[model samples]
Target: FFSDFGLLWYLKELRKEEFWKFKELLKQKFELKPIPWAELKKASKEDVAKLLDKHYPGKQAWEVTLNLFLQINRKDLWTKAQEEMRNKLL
Candidate 1:
């Protein structure tokens, strides 16, 4: 559901250090182009989702995002994100 977008949005709201750490992990894992941190932080949820879609279409986005959450050691976010998605379906 679209609530996964909320989880992505929450990443942008993380503290600067935390956000950068997550970005670093993403870059290392995905080999994505380097976007300026400022620009990335300013991007909207839709923009981020589109970027993710470009690299990982289909249900892979969900799998990749969950992997990312684990890589960043934020399984709490992963759990909450899944809960949000389930709630949206109901």
Candidate 2:
């Protein structure tokens, strides 16, 4: 069973286009190899989760993604992560 399941945290928009916000910064930060745009374009949020696991792994994916979302002007995603983050810390 994949432990990385649900790795996108609370930012759940499954539209193929939504994952694109993650691609460039995934490159910007940790040299986390990005999946092809067309591939990611068609991929689901779960696919994005697996790749985040492929790179950052575990909570680091959510942690850095908290920043990645913010940096990319996806405030709604970032805000949700932080809302959950509060409980994650508790």
Candidate 3:
């Protein structure tokens, strides 16, 4: 999921501030477990995927991520993600 311009790729590609806000949203919504930013000064795409899956898990992960993007008023990212997934398959 991290490779081939998929969800994880776009996630890591997000602007630094935007990415932090995204993770911040996750932390706010899933207060039980949050990202340990203190340990990861240089988070990779895999780190992003791991942190996300740790919270959402399985295919439902897509749903959670999609919803989060909408919450942040970034439907553009959701649409572009679909476009990339479509193109990657071809």
Candidate 4:
């Protein structure tokens, strides 16, 4: 879902260019890693935590937890959802 919509990739790329804007926002607010889907799901929480800790340190636990919530493999269905609800109708 996140991948197909370019959320992960877009967010990652954003980190490079508009990093000053998103870097601290994502770090302080979201605390997530810019990782691919396959690698994220195959990992256990402990493994992920360790990996994140190694790579992200201060943002490890938060990043791993956020990553864990984004393991939806049904990419197409996710696309449908996004298209159907690009914004909150309410």
lDDT score, residue 17, model 2?
Answer: 44
- Candidate that scores best on TM-score: 2
lDDT of 1 by residue, 1-90 (tens): 345453455455455565556655544455545445554566555565565666665376666677777776778777876776789788
Instruction: Estimate, for each residue in 20-40, the C-alpha lDDT of model 2 and write its tens digit.
Output: 666655644455555456545
lDDT tens string, model 3, 1-90? Answer: 445424675575577777766766665453345556652445565676776676555565676677677777778888877776578678
Q: Which portions of model 1 miss their true places by more than 4 Å? A: 1-7, 29-47, 88-90
Q: Which pairs clash inside model 2?
A: none
Show where candidate 4 strays beyond 4 Å: 1-33, 59-90
Q: After superposition, how far is residue 26 of candidate 2 from its true place, in Å?
A: 1.2
How much is 53 displaced in model 2, in angstroms?
1.2
Model 2 CA deviation exceeding 4 Å by range: 1-5, 14-18, 29-43
Residue-by-residue lDDT tens digits, candidate 4, 1-90: 243222342233222333333332333334345654444545543343344545565434344433423342333434444454456454
Model 2 residue 59 CA deviation in Å: 2.6
State every prediction's TM-score relative to the real structure: 0.55, 0.61, 0.60, 0.28
> Given candidate 1, what's the lDDT at residue 4?
41
